[PDB]
Amino acid sequence: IEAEAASILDRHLAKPVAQIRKEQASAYASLLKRAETAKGAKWAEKYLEDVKAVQWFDASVAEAPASGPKVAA
């Protein structure tokens, strides 16, 4: 895994930044519509529920970054 990640990174560090952001936005958007065209499957609702939970994590960190995410305490 160390050798795969060092091989994936060095292939990615040789790209210009405009290529990277649109290679990844193409791969992110293609993988959303594979979960959105999946009609009512339990894995597809759980997929898009976890995309909503990642966006909660990014939003809860933006509210207090020295604290982290907000847990119920």
């Binding site: 994590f57 990014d58 960190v61 933006a62 970054p65 020295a66 982290g68 995410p69 847990v71």
Partner: protein, 61 residues
């Protein structure tokens, strides 16, 4: 044939051999490293709104 006593190299060919490359601006090193260090600020500061510290070292709660 007075034109054959003029310098044969044009005024154009002087201005393209003296000004061959468009020179590098003084400010293009600032505004290109600053926009790249603004991504070093974002990911790696602890006061940024998008830090990677909760994505790479998840907190023990």
């Amino acid at each position: 044939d007075r034109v054959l006593s003029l310098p044969a190299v044009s005024k154009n060919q002087v201005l393209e051999n003296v000004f061959h490359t468009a020179p590098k601006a003084p400010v293009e090193h600032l505004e290109k490293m600053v926009s790249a260090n603004s991504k070093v600020y974002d990911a790696l500061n602890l006061q940024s709104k998008r830090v990677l510290i909760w994505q790479v070292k998840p907190a023990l709660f």
